[PDB]
Structure 1
Amino acid sequence: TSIMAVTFKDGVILGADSRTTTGAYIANRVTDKLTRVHDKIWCCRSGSAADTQAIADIVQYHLELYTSQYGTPSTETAASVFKELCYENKDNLTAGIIVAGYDDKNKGEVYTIPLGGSVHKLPYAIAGSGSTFIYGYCDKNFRENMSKEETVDFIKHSLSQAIKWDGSSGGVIRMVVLTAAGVERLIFYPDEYEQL
């Protein structure tokens, strides 16, 4: 899987490939790995598909119940609920989740939750099997307070490389843009990103 979340001036953007594998067989080539846990809190999923879906469904439930009682939860609160599930059930789970959200107060925020169940707040984050190949590229090319078009290009180029080298990643590049303006879904096909 190749997934990433990147903060920028107007907010945050999540990105992902669309490949799901069973050994060498691509079980779903058009997978949607960007899932919505609240209006403007989304996550990227890597690891066991069953585990990450089960977690994401429970988080969605917790935040819906939080909203009923205490209003809109912060991105930090969403990350804490993901962490709590992942840490306490570390022996039975294989889940690597990036949490990304837009507040008006805090603006864009990215939290990564690797296998251990630890939490790390970062300007951007990369994860999944295909992320190994783009550490070098992403570190050299990331800047803070990029524009929307720059951040879309930074994610598109990065995942293009992750897809190129990782057999476990592939298909379309999906993105989800989180700003004050709302929620925008973007898709990019092989014919576009392969020629970069």
Structure 2
Amino acid sequence: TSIMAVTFKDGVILGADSRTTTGAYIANRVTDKLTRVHDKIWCCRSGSAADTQAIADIVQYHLELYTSQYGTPSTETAASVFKELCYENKDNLTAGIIVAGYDDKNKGEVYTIPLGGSVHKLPYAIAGSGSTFIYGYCDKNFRENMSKEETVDFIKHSLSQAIKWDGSSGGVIRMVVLTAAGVERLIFYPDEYEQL
């Protein structure tokens, strides 16, 4: 994997490639690594497919039960539930999860949860095997309070490079936009992003 989430003026955008590997074989070239735990709280999944999937499902269950009793949960609350599972089961899990959500009070927020189960709230976050190749690029090019079109270009260009260098990353670039307006899914094919 190459995954990232970036806050901006109107909210937050999640981004991911679509490659799933079993060794050097691509088991799925059209994977959807961006998953919904709540209406406007989503996560990017990296590491073990089975682990991250099981975790996300449990979180979705917890936040559904939270909503039934206490109304809409904060993005921080969602990240806390992710942490709780990842930290307490650190010996049996291989999951690198980025949590991103949109409140109306707090606007866009991004929390990254690495292998250990620690939590880190950031303006933007990158993760997965392909993220190593774009630390330099992302750091130089990220700005706070970007527009929607700028943030889409930032993620597109970043993941394009991550895909270019990482063999474990590829396929289409999926994105999910989280704003007050609603939820918007975007897709970008090789013929476009490769020649950026």
Alignment TM-score, normalising by the size of structure 2:
1.00
SS in 2 for 1:195: coil
Shift of residue 137 of structure 1? 0.0
Shift of residue 12 of structure 1? 0.0
SS in 2 for 1:76: helix
Shift of residue 9 of structure 1? 0.1
Aligned to 2:175: 175
Question: Identity over the aligned pairs, expressed in percent?
Answer: 100
d(CA) in 2 for partners of 1:138 and 1:24? Answer: 27
d(CA) in 1 for partners of 2:195 and 2:131? Answer: 20
SS in 1 for 2:167: coil
**Is it true that 1:65 corresponds to 2:98 in the alignment?**
no
Aligned to 1:111: 111
**Is it true that 1:165 corresponds to 2:165 in the alignment?**
yes
- 1:7-43 Cα offsets, whole Å, 9 max, x none, are 0000000000000000010000000000000000000
Aligned to 2:86: 86
d(CA) in 2 for partners of 1:85 and 1:78? Answer: 11
SS in 2 for 1:150: helix
Aligned residues: 196
Unaligned 5+ runs, structure 1: none
> For residues 134-173 of structure 1, what are the structure 2 equivalents within 5 Å?
134-173=134-173
d(CA) in 2 for partners of 1:39 and 1:192? Answer: 30
Shift of residue 66 of structure 1? 0.1
Shift of residue 65 of structure 1? 0.1
Alignment TM-score, normalising by the size of structure 1:
1.00
d(CA) in 1 for partners of 2:52 and 2:77? Answer: 18
- 1:39-60 Cα offsets, whole Å, 9 max, x none, are 0000000000000000000000
Shift of residue 140 of structure 1? 0.1
d(CA) in 2 for partners of 1:180 and 1:117? Answer: 30
d(CA) in 2 for partners of 1:49 and 1:128? Answer: 12
Unaligned 5+ runs, structure 2: none
- 1:124-169 Cα offsets, whole Å, 9 max, x none, are 0000000000000000000000000000000000000000000000
